[PDB]
Design a protein around this ligand. Structure first.
Ligand SMILES: N[C@@H](Cc1c[nH]c2ccccc12)C(=O)O
Ligand SMILES: [Zn+2]
Length: 123
């Protein structure tokens, strides 16, 4: 009864440079015969003031997507090659390939999520 169209074995925690625990992936390049993007992220109600990574890079462009049940329920700081940016949910920020970056949760409610959509199949 495993259905080839359904993956329940999630998240997939992958070792990623800059991170101190594995990064929780929901889409990986090896799923469904090969995917053109990867996606990782999580709920940040417990991550306010706690960054998941140091400044890091990836060989592909990465889009951050920040959502929360209430408008403006979540806020993150993103460092982009040393320059502070802030996002208020809902928001999307592009992180160019090669850019040294990371994010910090400054505010979150139950149900706030940040995802990173990696526009390629390599890390
Ligand atoms: N892949 C993302 C990681 C990420 C985005 N949102 C998150 C929320 C919780 C934990 C990890 C994340 C990055 O490189 O930054
Ligand atoms: Zn990243």
């Amino acid at each position: 009864p495993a259905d080839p169209e359904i993956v329940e074995g999630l998240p997939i925690p992958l070792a990623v440079a800059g991170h101190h625990q594995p990064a929780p992936f929901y889409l990986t390049a090896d799923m469904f015969g090969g995917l053109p993007v990867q996606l990782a992220g999580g709920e940040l109600s417990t991550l306010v003031g706690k960054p998941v990574a140091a400044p890091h890079t990836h060989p592909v462009d990465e889009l951050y997507l920040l959502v929360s049940p209430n408008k403006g329920g979540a806020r993150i700081e993103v460092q982009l090659d040393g320059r502070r940016h802030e996002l208020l949910s809902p928001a999307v920020m592009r992180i160019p390939a090669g850019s040294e970056h990371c994010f910090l949760t400054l505010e979150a409610e139950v149900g706030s999520y940040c995802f990173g959509i990696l526009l390629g199949d390599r890390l």
